């Protein structure tokens, strides 16, 4: 059971209020990261590890890791960071088939920023 991705941006600060569209692709063999939207689509249910290191050239930075719960049919910020120019973070999240995870930043308009996730434990039922 394989499902992983690692993507980059190579810029200072992308556009806010939208999913960060990471263009640079370090790994994406299962094609579970959508480069056209910046969202990771879960196709294998289980526990996933997400890690990111984002640089931001904005004021009042607000970094959020979103999860769209497919079964609950609603989106929420599973993780949030505030007022940090160089925001780093990592978290474990359990995902179901259809769930979506992506990164988002908010700030006021006035370096490799990464976003990595992989399946650690797959569900066994």
């Amino acid at each position: 059971y394989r499902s992983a991705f690692s993507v980059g941006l190579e810029t200072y600060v992308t556009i806010p209020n939208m999913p960060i569209r990471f263009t640079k692709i370090f790994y994406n063999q299962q094609n579970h990261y959508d480069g056209s939207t910046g969202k990771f689509h879960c196709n294998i249910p289980g526990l996933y590890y997400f890690a990111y290191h984002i640089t931001v050239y904005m004021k009042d930075v607000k970094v959020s890791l979103f999860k769209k719960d497919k079964a609950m049919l609603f989106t929420y910020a599973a993780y949030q960071e505030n007022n940090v120019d160089q925001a780093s973070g990592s978290v474990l999240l359990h995902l179901e088939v259809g769930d979506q995870v992506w990164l988002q930043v908010y700030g006021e308009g006035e370096n490799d920023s990464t976003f990595t996730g992989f399946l650690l434990y797959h569900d066994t039922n």
Copy 2:
């Protein structure tokens, strides 16, 4: 073989000289992280990956990752960071049954801070 946890705090700077008691729980299905103490208890021996991203609102910050060696019957700082407001780190540690791992900070009294660990390789004997 599953053993993982990912926990948060959602505050600026917790209390020093004691294990950081992470209240927010992102994942804890094996119930190996003690929310009442902030210590992870190893129940499966093997190689574990620990990662943390702590924000601190204190002076002369001192971030330490402690390991209580059950067999050696003594506690030591397996990792330490000094004079960093936004401390990030990750490390691989081999643990035995009964070992304990936790985070601790020291500073002078005057944002999601995470602490994640999971079993990478379990011992085979």
Copy 3:
């Protein structure tokens, strides 16, 4: 299939223009990290996760994660960070037998810095 390492330095800023020779060893049971050179040697082909948290006491810092592609017979910077005193990063990289991965920093001459990697998915053919 096991192949992992986690190493430290315990200093402020090592020497530039050369692979960072991490002397402190948190884990190295497969002996795939060369302490005399600072390079990780891949002996099991597959997808590897690399994470690092380097502190630097230099000006115009330039942190790079190098990969020597054994089959292509050439070395390139798989990851790069610029003008960051406390540089953190993580990435997934696929490696073949003979590939080498190491960290490198550039700066102008005027705290635990870690470097961790482990085999996530091994190739199955």
